[PDB]
Amino acid sequence: SMEQVAMELRLTELTRLLRSVLDQLQDKDPARIFAQPVSLKEVPDYLDHIKHPMDFATMRKRLEAQGYKNLHEFEEDFDLIIDNCMKYNARDTVFYRAAVRLRDQGGVVLRQARREVDSIG
């Protein structure tokens, strides 16, 4: 149908906007601490601690399959990256500290993304 096409164009455009959001958030991780999944070869107990691992490469795979229906779903995955890290790592670690800085700097990006998503519909 024509409606299904219009819906698909909307999703494509959301995907475009989320891709720019993802790029802007990933720039706030210049150390690349959150770029890839925590390695289960190197951290073999990880899934005993963290039940829903997340990282920017995994988000990008989902994004490119158009698997984010709305900004909430995308934000859920970003918050998992941060929250997983702040539980597994202690406060005095470069990893925890990187997550705090990513959360703080990402807030600004996500605030305007939400306005754009609502504004453009």
Q: What residue spans define the domains of the chain?
A: 1-121
Q: How far is CA 72 from the centre of its chain?
A: 11
The total number of residues shown for the chain amounts to 121
Structure tokens at 33: 């601490």
Rounded alpha-carbon distances, angstroms, from residue 37 to 50, 57, 62, 75, 112: 12, 7, 14, 17, 27
d(CA 112, CA 20): 12
d(CA 117, CA 18): 10
72 close to 65: Cβ distance less than 8 angstroms: no
56, exposed or middle or buried, with CB in 10 Å at 0-12, 13-18, 19+? buried
Coil, helix or strand at residue 28: coil
Cα-Cα-Cα-Cα dihedral sign, residues 75, 84, 40, 24: positive
Amino acid found at 39: S
Tell me which residue of 37, 42, 31 sits closest to 94, measured CA to CA.
Answer: 31
Name the class of domain 1-121. mainly alpha
54 close to 84: Cβ distance less than 8 angstroms: yes
Expressed in Å, this structure's resolution amounts to: 1.5
Segments of 1-121 assigned E as strands: none
| Cα 115-79-17 angle, rounded to 5 deg | 35
